[PDB]
Each structure stands twice: as C-alpha cells, then as structure tokens.
Design a protein around this ligand. Structure first.
Ligand SMILES: [Cl-]
Ligand SMILES: [Cl-]
Ligand SMILES: [Cl-]
Ligand SMILES: [Cl-]
Ligand SMILES: [Cl-]
Ligand SMILES: [Cl-]
Ligand SMILES: [Cl-]
Ligand SMILES: [Cl-]
Ligand SMILES: [Cl-]
Ligand SMILES: [Cl-]
Ligand SMILES: [Cl-]
Ligand SMILES: [Cl-]
Ligand SMILES: [Cl-]
Ligand SMILES: [Cl-]
Ligand SMILES: [Cl-]
Ligand SMILES: [Cl-]
Ligand SMILES: [Cl-]
Ligand SMILES: [Cl-]
Ligand SMILES: [Cl-]
Ligand SMILES: [Cl-]
Ligand SMILES: [Cl-]
Ligand SMILES: [Cl-]
Ligand SMILES: [Cl-]
Ligand SMILES: [Cl-]
Ligand SMILES: [Cl-]
Ligand SMILES: [Cl-]
Ligand SMILES: [Cl-]
Ligand SMILES: [Cl-]
Ligand SMILES: [Mg+2]
Ligand SMILES: [Mg+2]
Ligand SMILES: [Mg+2]
Ligand SMILES: [Mg+2]
Ligand SMILES: [Mg+2]
Ligand SMILES: [Mg+2]
Ligand SMILES: [Mg+2]
Ligand SMILES: [Mg+2]
Ligand SMILES: [Mg+2]
Ligand SMILES: [Mg+2]
Ligand SMILES: [Mg+2]
Ligand SMILES: [Mg+2]
Ligand SMILES: [Mg+2]
Ligand SMILES: [Mg+2]
Ligand SMILES: [Mg+2]
Ligand SMILES: [Mg+2]
Ligand SMILES: [Mg+2]
Ligand SMILES: [Mg+2]
Ligand SMILES: [Mg+2]
Ligand SMILES: [Mg+2]
Ligand SMILES: [Mg+2]
Ligand SMILES: [Mg+2]
Ligand SMILES: [Mg+2]
Ligand SMILES: [Mg+2]
Ligand SMILES: [Mg+2]
Ligand SMILES: [Mg+2]
Ligand SMILES: [Mg+2]
Ligand SMILES: [Mg+2]
Ligand SMILES: [Mg+2]
Ligand SMILES: [Mg+2]
Ligand SMILES: [Mg+2]
Ligand SMILES: [Mg+2]
Lengths: 174, 174, 174, 174, 174, 174
C-alpha cells in the first residue's frame, strides 16, 4: 500500500494514464493481428499485406511492453484491463484495411499527445522525454507511411481494381 | 456467405471450437505477460522469473497465430472475442506464479483434449494430426516443467524463504 | 485545399515558421559556399579554409532537406522563396570569415529558439523534440567551434599575420 | 583591383558569362530540390521520383561548384546573385515534373551553347574545352534521358493513369 | 568580465545551477569511492560490492565532466567548490551501503528536476534537452537498479545473514 | 576497535600519514581537472592542453585508489576529508598552468619524501618499497616533464606569444 522506494515526481494521474496507454497499445496489436489474417484468407490471398500487418502487430506488443517497463521503472503499479476485439469493421479490401490502420494510428497519437500534456501539467520531464523519444516520432512516421499507402492504392484504382491491390502487394509491401 | 473453395471435411462445430481455442491461447499469452512484469517490480526484483514468463507469453502468441493460420488453411472464418484480463489473483511469490501457470497450462490442455475429441467425433484426421503434432506434446512438456519448478521451489522452502526464490531465479531460470 | 490525411496537432503558424527556417538553412548553405571559394582564390590560397567552409555548406543543405521532410511528415506544404545572396561583406581574411560564420550560426540559433517557443506555445511536443534532437545541440557545438577558431586566430596574431592564418589552416583545419 | 597574377587570355565578358552560368546551375539545383519533395508529399507518395530528382539536384550543385573552381583557376572573380525560387508551376504529376525538367535542361544547354559561342569569339580554347568536356555531353545525355522518361509516361497513359506513374516509379526509377 | 562570444539564451541563474550540479556529481563520485573501499576491508571482504561501487564512482566523475563541458559550450564559467567528505555514516553492511546509494541517487535526481524546472522557467530548450538526454533516464535506471538490489538483500535475510550478502555478491554483482 | 587480523609492523602514525597522502592525491586530481576545463573555454581554446591535464587528473585518482588499497592491505582504516577546491589562482595562460602543475608535483613529492622518512623511522620496509616502487620515480618523471614543458614555452615566447602556446599545443601535446 505504502509508497514504492523508487517513486519520485510520478503523479497518480500519470500512473493511471500510462495503464490506459498500455491497454491501447495491446488493442492496436490485436487490430493489426486481425487485419493480418484477413489477407491470409483463401478468398483475399494477399500475402505481403498479411506480413505487413503481422509485423505492425508485433511492433505494438513491443510498444506495450516498453510502457509496462516504464511503469515499474517509475514505481507505479501495472493495472491491466480486457483487450477489446477489433472495432473497425469487416476488412473488405487492402485499401479499407490501410484506412482503418491510418485512423487507429491517429487515435493512438491523440492518446499520446494527451499523455504528454498531462506529464507537462505535472512537471514530469522524465515522462515527457520518454514519450517524445520512444513514441511521438514513431507515430508521425507510421501515420505518414499509411497515408502514402492509402494514396498509392487510391491512385492505382483500388478497391475496384483487384489488379491494383495485387501489384501494390508485390511492389510496395514485397 | 457461400462455401470457401478450399473447405473439405471441416465441420462448423470444429470451426467454432478452433475460434474458442484462439481466444484461450491469447488469454494465456496475457496471463504470462502480467506475471512477467510482476517480477520486474522494484519490490519483487527477480529478473529471470520475469524473462521466463515473457518467453512463455511470446510462445502462446505463436500458438494463437498457428491456429489462425489453420482456420484459413481449412476455409473456416476467424471470429475474435475480447481477451479477458488475467484472473489467477495478485501474484504474491515466484511459487504462487508457478502454481498459477501450472493450473493455466492444465486448463489449456483440457481445452485441447476436448477439441481433439470433437475432431475425432467428426472424423477429421487432418485436425486430429494438427492438434497432436503442434499442441499435445508441447502441453505435456510445459506441464511437466512447471511441476518440476513448483517441486523445487517447495523443497527449497518457498514462499517464506526469499533466499530460495533468489537462488532458484539464478540456478534454474538463469 | 482540404486537410492532409496525416495532419494532426500541426498549427498553421508552425507550418509557416518551418518554411521560413527552410529558407534560412538554404541561405546559410549559400553563405558558406561563397566563403569556401573565397579561400580558393589565387590571392588568398588557404585550401583547408576552403574545404572547411564547403563541408559546412553541404551540412546546411542537409539541415534544409531534413526540414522539408518534416514539413511533409506532418502534412504541411512546402513554400519556397528566393535564396538571397550572402550579405556578410567582402571576406577579407580567415579571421573575418570565421567571425561572419559565428554571427550566421548565432542568428540561425535565435531563429530555431523562436521556432521552439512557437511549438511550445502551440503544445506541439513532436516539433519541440524534432528541433531539440536534430538542431539545438548542433547549433551549440557549431557556435562553440567557431568561437574556438576565432580565439586561436586572434591569439596567433590574425589578420595582420599571414603566417598565423597559414599555420591555423595547416594545424587546425588540416 | 589590378590583374590576377594567373589571368591569361580570359576575357571580362567570359568572366561575367561564367558568373551567370553559376547562378543558372544553382537555380537548376533548386528546381530539382522542389520537384523532389513534391513526390515525398503524403498525397503524391512516389518515393523513386523523389530520389531521382534529389540526385539531379545534388548533380546541379556539383556543376555550380566546378564553375566556381574554373572562375578562380582562370583568375576571374566570383559574383553571386540571389537564387530565384522555382518557376515551372505546381508540379501536378510525375509526367508534368519530367516535362518541366526537360524544358529546364534544354534552357541550361542553350545557355552553355551561348557561353561556348562567346569563348569561340574570344579565342579561348581552354574555356571551349572546359565546356565541351564537363558540360555539353552531360546536357545531351540528361535531355535524352528525360525525353525517354516523358515518352514512357505518355505511352503508359500518364497523367490520368495513377497506375502508370506508380509502375514507372518502380520499374524505371527503382 | 564582458560576455562570452558564444553565449546565447543562457541565464546567469542556469550557469550558477550547473556549477552547483557539478559539485553534487563530484560529491556522488566521492561517496561511491568511500563505499567501494569499505567492501575491500579485510573484515568485510565482498570484492563484487567493491567493484560495483568503484564503477559507480567512475560514472559520477564522467557525469561531472559532461557538465563542465556543457558550461563551456554555453559560454558560462566553471566555479568549483570543496568536495565534501561522504555523510551517509559508517557503512555497516552491503544492505546499508545500497540504501545510502538509493538515497544519494534520489537526492541527485531531485537536484536535476529542480535544474530542469529552472531551465523551463528561463525558456532554455537546449539545457532542458541536455538534462533529459544525458541525466534524467540515467537517474531513473540507477534508482530502479538500487531498489531492486535493496529488495533482494532484504528478501535474502540481510543484514543479519552474512551468507545472504556473500551470495548476492557472487550472483548479482559477480 | 580491536586490531585488524592482518595488521603487522604498521605504525598508527604511518596509517594516519597514508590517509593524509590519499587526500593530497585527490586534491591533485581536482587541480588538474580545473586546469583541463580552463583550456576548453571558448576564449582559451587549446584542446591538447585540455586533454593533457585531464589525463593527469585521471592518473592522480588512480594514485589515490592505490593508497586506499594499500591502507586496507596493511589493515589500516581509511579516513577521508573534504577535497579542497584548487588554490593555484586564475589559470591565465598555458605557461602559468604548467608552472602551477610543476609546483603541485614538487609539493606532492615533498609529502611522499616525508612519508618515506616516517616509514624509515618506523622500520616499515614494505611501506618504503611501496612508496619507492609506485610513487617516487613517477614524481621525478612528472617533475622533469613539466620542467621541460615550462622551458619550451618560455623559449618559444609564452605567455605574450599566443602563437607560441598554439604551436606547443600542436607539436608537444598533440
Ligand atoms: Cl507525493
Ligand atoms: Cl490505473
Ligand atoms: Cl476489464
Ligand atoms: Cl524521421
Ligand atoms: Cl458439408
Ligand atoms: Cl465462432
Ligand atoms: Cl467479445
Ligand atoms: Cl518429449
Ligand atoms: Cl549458490
Ligand atoms: Cl553459480
Ligand atoms: Cl484544426
Ligand atoms: Cl508559408
Ligand atoms: Cl521569393
Ligand atoms: Cl555535445
Ligand atoms: Cl588584357
Ligand atoms: Cl559578373
Ligand atoms: Cl541578386
Ligand atoms: Cl555518351
Ligand atoms: Cl518486378
Ligand atoms: Cl542577456
Ligand atoms: Cl556559480
Ligand atoms: Cl568551497
Ligand atoms: Cl530505459
Ligand atoms: Cl603493536
Ligand atoms: Cl587518520
Ligand atoms: Cl574534512
Ligand atoms: Cl625512468
Ligand atoms: Cl609549425
Ligand atoms: Mg483505452
Ligand atoms: Mg508500426
Ligand atoms: Mg503503438
Ligand atoms: Mg464488445
Ligand atoms: Mg528521436
Ligand atoms: Mg474461452
Ligand atoms: Mg510454453
Ligand atoms: Mg498455448
Ligand atoms: Mg472482467
Ligand atoms: Mg510430435
Ligand atoms: Mg528568413
Ligand atoms: Mg556545421
Ligand atoms: Mg543549419
Ligand atoms: Mg539583394
Ligand atoms: Mg520538452
Ligand atoms: Mg541530442
Ligand atoms: Mg541567369
Ligand atoms: Mg543530371
Ligand atoms: Mg547543370
Ligand atoms: Mg520572384
Ligand atoms: Mg574546338
Ligand atoms: Mg567527353
Ligand atoms: Mg551542492
Ligand atoms: Mg551509475
Ligand atoms: Mg550523476
Ligand atoms: Mg565537514
Ligand atoms: Mg534518452
Ligand atoms: Mg593534506
Ligand atoms: Mg602524471
Ligand atoms: Mg600523485
Ligand atoms: Mg576554501
Ligand atoms: Mg621502479
């Protein structure tokens, strides 16, 4: 009950915000897992879409683990919640999955910006630096990459052109 | 809606049982993740317990992925549910975590034996072979290893002896 | 006209400030280019001064390119202006060029500090981290190096001693 | 004020023409820089167009530096002017950028042919050889390459076909 | 007396705070030096405790040197004070030394957080980034490691169990 | 309180003299540290003077550590005092720093000769051999090197000639 021997300048509200961010990162890992195996279906059959989203799934589990490490490093206590099944919808196409991923990463970035605003308000420069170093530029690069992918698929004629998704699978994700 | 072009000798009940087993494997990955970071806390501080359970967590995510591949290979459709937060309790000690892991793996094995009985009842030898090849002996080895670990910790004087858990961490999990 | 699909927490004023900083970095590349070839003249003939300033010129073009990448990563639109010819004056000596470079880098640093104050005012932690990571310490090291060079040239007897500039060229810039 | 000790058979008009050519080469570097980052935008997203034009930008800066070296080698004095922002227009498409580049390189070649006619009129065989050796065939190869690129993009169905620009990006510029 | 040629956006109060932090880092190096040689005594004789604290001593001297470099880089003037002999007390045991080290590192971290609050108040983003990059996470990792060590020693039965300190020396610090 | 089990032929007065010599070696490390960073200032800017004195600082910390080892080897008890800030004065020039270092090393040598006279008076041949083996010739070589450096700087025209200190920095300390 009494304080962690390591805890210093770590607000209860920051501790709770980090637990919510852990859940969000595990949720993002689950969304990309579901998206991956959609492209593995025999009636979709785009293997590089499947590999691309599995890699993204594995990266989100690493992002969750790094926040669980941070919680312990600062003397906070991890509190886990259910990982909700993916919302987005039935995946429909390579383009629609890429658009769901863009929205997911823009929602994760908004959560991280709220987390950074709280750490700023509580004058926690270690937590500010943590978020900036490990999360904020990774989100900007992820969002830019997904926007690039959505643009190419749209220009190529997706989702109507099954040829467009096939050739994007080989040339961009291959 | 209409049948997958690949589907052959794959009962609707088998398809549903495989989706339930996917959820159970993701749940087991989550239980071991939680257990891992407990041992990373500054007031527990057993780093080889933490690494041992993280590795086990990563192995369960691989077990889930292999069942999602199987579902697609057979022309079934993956249906995901929420991943429940870990039940077990507050982890308390290295011994108590090992005992929770033993119970978890004995519950996963019972699920797989029920799955095998269903595949047997539906005369699905491919699914029987899948379960036997990739799951049943992995469960028997996991259960035997966790029983060995629980025995050693008990003989060494855990959970009262903090020396016992420390030296087990170095010599068995190190 | 309508918003970039990637744009998030990126103020119009930040977007414009980044375009002004791009112009300033290209201007700094031009100042160092001019300084370089002054030392290549047959009546100046200090080859290590020439190489030192050419390298500095190439570094400023890289600094401009990284800001053009950032503008696109954040969903801003690059707006280019004329690159003004160098102001400073006729270069006169190794010491006078080093003093012009010190003033240039102290003016670029003041621009970057104003840019950081704007990003702080608009609560853009990604842009704050970008400036701190890629620009602020590079400016402090550049300013310290140029101050060191100016000090040595002054102590050695420059600009009157042509021997001083010759031996500095060989021993410090060689 | 008085003559460079190295100057021999180098007409004042040649000296001035070389300074104008320096400005034109820096302007061409700026045009290709702008074109490069257009293709880096999230709503254009053709990375090999972007790399192709950045390389061309870097080559034009080298062409400018070689003329600044020549000016000093002959005992002329470098005189720099503002580098104008790119004219061409909004870039619109891969085809339109390639067409702007073709017009740019045909304007640079006309400048170099005028420069060669002046050196011929002033009986400066060193300057004639300089232009022929380092510039004239580089312009003919650049113009031929850009014409080839424009032809392919037109035959492939650009600019209407976003598929055409995508596949040209992978197969020709990749 | 008059201003350093390099000084820009570096408040007199920041300059003084950096000199106080230099003294604190040298004091921390001295505390760990004293602790090291305690464990080298023939009536204590724990060689891995001795090596662990000597390494920590050498790391604190590096932390002091990096702040003396920063002071010069920013155009401040180093002002040195006596390095006080270690306070803590007679070292008594491996556990008591580890507890003194935990308190030392939590006092150094509080000094660095006060330093960061001053740099924030004076809008010095270069100094904020310096502290965050080189100091704040190094303090969080140091504090977490020392808390882990204190926990293990307590669980193992230290300081009463001389066996506990012996086996910790071999297995954790060895 | 009672005697160390290892103590043999080690006089209380020798024990106290060794503690005073430890303080003197730490003081010499501090003097050279201060001298080092003086030459790192932007208005002094002699980098090989700075490296030379930092190396000397690191060597004095090693000399202190070896005496703390000796104290324990002989069964004496280390007693630490404050490390006084450097006396010498404001450093002024490369020559003045070298002259302060010569005086420092001649004061350390006089302390060691007094220490050797005490060990001789107490018939401690182990301590006599320790001082002769590890300290006395290191002091004679240090004093000879600093005298050589002072001579060269004086002959070269230091401290008036800033050229002299610059060229000594490159050729002797480089
Ligand atoms: Cl509190
Ligand atoms: Cl919580
Ligand atoms: Cl929940
Ligand atoms: Cl980046
Ligand atoms: Cl059927
Ligand atoms: Cl189902
Ligand atoms: Cl559900
Ligand atoms: Cl087996
Ligand atoms: Cl053991
Ligand atoms: Cl062992
Ligand atoms: Cl808005
Ligand atoms: Cl603008
Ligand atoms: Cl303009
Ligand atoms: Cl640095
Ligand atoms: Cl003439
Ligand atoms: Cl001209
Ligand atoms: Cl102009
Ligand atoms: Cl050819
Ligand atoms: Cl291909
Ligand atoms: Cl001021
Ligand atoms: Cl001060
Ligand atoms: Cl003092
Ligand atoms: Cl870390
Ligand atoms: Cl006695
Ligand atoms: Cl004493
Ligand atoms: Cl004292
Ligand atoms: Cl010798
Ligand atoms: Cl020389
Ligand atoms: Mg949430
Ligand atoms: Mg990712
Ligand atoms: Mg993430
Ligand atoms: Mg639900
Ligand atoms: Mg970064
Ligand atoms: Mg279930
Ligand atoms: Mg396992
Ligand atoms: Mg499993
Ligand atoms: Mg529940
Ligand atoms: Mg088998
Ligand atoms: Mg401007
Ligand atoms: Mg530079
Ligand atoms: Mg720059
Ligand atoms: Mg003008
Ligand atoms: Mg900040
Ligand atoms: Mg940095
Ligand atoms: Mg022109
Ligand atoms: Mg070219
Ligand atoms: Mg050209
Ligand atoms: Mg204009
Ligand atoms: Mg000819
Ligand atoms: Mg040729
Ligand atoms: Mg203090
Ligand atoms: Mg440390
Ligand atoms: Mg420190
Ligand atoms: Mg005192
Ligand atoms: Mg860091
Ligand atoms: Mg003394
Ligand atoms: Mg020495
Ligand atoms: Mg010494
Ligand atoms: Mg005093
Ligand atoms: Mg000897």
């Amino acid at each position: 009950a009494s304080t962690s021997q390591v805890r210093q300048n770590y607000h209860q509200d920051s501790e709770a915000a980090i637990n919510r961010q852990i859940n969000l990162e595990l949720y993002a890992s689950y969304v990309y897992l579901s998206m991956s195996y959609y492209f593995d279906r025999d009636d979709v059959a785009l293997k590089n879409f499947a590999k691309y989203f599995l890699h993204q799934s594995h990266e989100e589990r690493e992002h969750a683990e790094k926040l669980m490490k941070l919680q312990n490093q600062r003397g906070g206590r991890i509190f886990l919640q259910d990982i909700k099944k993916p919302d987005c919808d039935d995946w429909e196409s390579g383009l629609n999955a890429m658009e769901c991923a863009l929205h997911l990463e823009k929602n994760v970035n908004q959560s991280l910006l709220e987390l950074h605003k709280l750490a700023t308000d509580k004058n926690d420069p270690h937590l500010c630096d943590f978020i900036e170093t490990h999360y904020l530029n990774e989100q900007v690069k992820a969002i830019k990459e997904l926007g690039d992918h959505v643009t190419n698929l749209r220009k190529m004629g997706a989702p109507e052109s099954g040829l467009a998704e096939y050739l994007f699978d080989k040339h961009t994700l291959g």
